[PDB]
């Protein structure tokens, strides 16, 4: 069917320009739909930024003044967002979506991409294994985890066993301190499967192009 995906730098310096791309597959953007950009600030407030439609029609949120521009590339079936002179107020999660005349978007929204406006430098996380100290009542469940410490900016993508294990997983919201983020993730599995069956946490940090796979071993 129709699928939208946003992409672009997750860190932009203040005063500079933010640029994002929405790659559409399964439908031509030269159609009469509002290919729009929407953003969600920390706190969850949603804002309509604007759209491009039928290739030559654009509409923008008046509050953005003349710093926003939305354009497209038919040959690549992609549309873009350019937001100039950004400030920390522009830090948010950006989403692309297809709106029709009646306001219906169906499930045609992208997964969203985070953009942080800051002067701080990108810092990759250090990933540490969390394995139980001693032994407890087996024949039941066991909880393991991973500590993702000292990274910037958000976000980090945490999966267990390449994402083939998603049930019983708790990845907590990061905490900010000294311009660095720290987060943890827990995974609970049948005690009968650990340490016999390997359990590994995969941690990716898009902004720094790093990825760590940390196998949890008994101590």
């Amino acid at each position: 069917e129709v699928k939208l995906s946003e992409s672009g730098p997750g860190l932009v310096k203040p005063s500079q320009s933010l640029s994002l791309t929405c790659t559409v597959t399964g439908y031509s953007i030269t159609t009469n739909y509002a290919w729009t950009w929407i953003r969600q600030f920390p706190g969850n407030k949603l804002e309509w930024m604007g759209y491009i439609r039928s290739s030559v029609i654009t509409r923008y949120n008046p509050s953005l003044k003349s710093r926003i521009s939305i354009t497209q590339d038919t040959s690549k079936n992609q549309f873009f967002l350019q937001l100039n002179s950004v400030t920390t107020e522009d830090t948010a999660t950006y989403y692309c979506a297809r709106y029709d005349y009646y306001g219906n978007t169906g499930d045609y929204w992208g997964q969203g991409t985070s953009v942080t406006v800051s002067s701080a430098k990108t810092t990759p996380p250090s990933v540490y294994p969390l394995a139980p100290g001693t032994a407890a009542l087996k024949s039941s469940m066991v909880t393991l985890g991973c500590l993702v410490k000292g990274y910037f900016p958000e976000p980090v993508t945490v999966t267990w066993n390449s994402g083939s294990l998603s049930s019983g997983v708790h990845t907590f919201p990061a905490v900010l301190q000294s311009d660095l983020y720290t987060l943890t993730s827990s995974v609970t599995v049948p005690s009968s499967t650990w340490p016999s069956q390997t359990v590994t946490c995969n941690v990716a940090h898009p902004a720094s192009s790093t990825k760590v796979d940390k196998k949890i071993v008994p101590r």
Binding site: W48, Y102, G106, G112, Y128, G145, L147, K149, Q177
Partner: protein, 216 residues
């Protein structure tokens, strides 16, 4: 621009019961074609917004018939029949009659499930972090309800309040529970100066705190 206000729910709702969420606009959303252009979206924990209703009362493709919408020109209501655990998240309405197409402030929906004590687990610093000179002790308080909870750290039997940072998850979409992580961070030297590390969780489910510990 049009301002859409939404009020918060007064309490978590019981699964299976009916729930109503409101939205109010500073201008009529009734258009010249007799249709009212008002959308209702649900944003589940960690997900992108999903359209539930458009044109005030029309269900989007694949949306459960448990969701219905009504209202006048400036007052609208989303009614959820037989609420389910998967319906938790934040509901937003949006108007589609004037630029910019503004969204309401949103209404959070929580489910009041049976009380559940947390499953507590504590973890010592990793050998890898220790070679780095740091030492983080992590404690997970998983799958409990209600959300209110208190964690206390003790080192060699003595309470500790410095260097602790907590994080809470939103309500789980599958089992309607909450989880929390508590992390105590100290320098390697500090950590090496003590033997007993304890995590103490106090919940409404019991009189006595749940205690988890380990000896370096």
């Amino acid at each position: 621009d049009i301002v859409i206000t939404q009020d918060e729910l007064s309490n978590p709702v019981t699964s299976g019961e009916s729930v109503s969420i409101s939205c109010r606009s500073s201008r009529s959303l009734l258009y010249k074609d007799g249709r009212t252009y008002l959308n209702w979206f649900l944003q589940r924990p960690g997900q992108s917004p999903q359209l539930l209703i458009y044109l005030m009362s029309t269900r989007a493709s694949g949306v459960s018939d448990r969701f219905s919408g009504s209202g006048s020109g400036t007052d609208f209501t989303l009614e959820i029949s037989r609420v389910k655990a998967e319906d938790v998240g934040v509901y937003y309405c949006q108007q589609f009659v004037e630029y910019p197409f503004t969204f309401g402030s949103g209404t959070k929906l929580e489910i009041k499930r049976a009380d559940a004590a947390p499953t507590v687990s504590i973890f010592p610093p990793s050998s890898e972090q220790l070679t780095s000179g740091g030492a983080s002790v992590v404690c997970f308080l998983n799958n409990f309800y209600p959300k209110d909870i208190n964690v206390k750290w003790k080192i060699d039997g003595s309470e500790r309040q410095n260097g602790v940072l907590n994080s809470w998850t939103d309500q789980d979409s599958k089992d309607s529970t909450y989880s929390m992580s508590s992390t105590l961070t100290l320098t390697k030297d500090e950590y090496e100066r003590h033997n007993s590390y304890t995590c103490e969780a106090t919940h409404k489910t019991s009189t006595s705190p749940i205690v988890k510990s380990f000896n370096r």
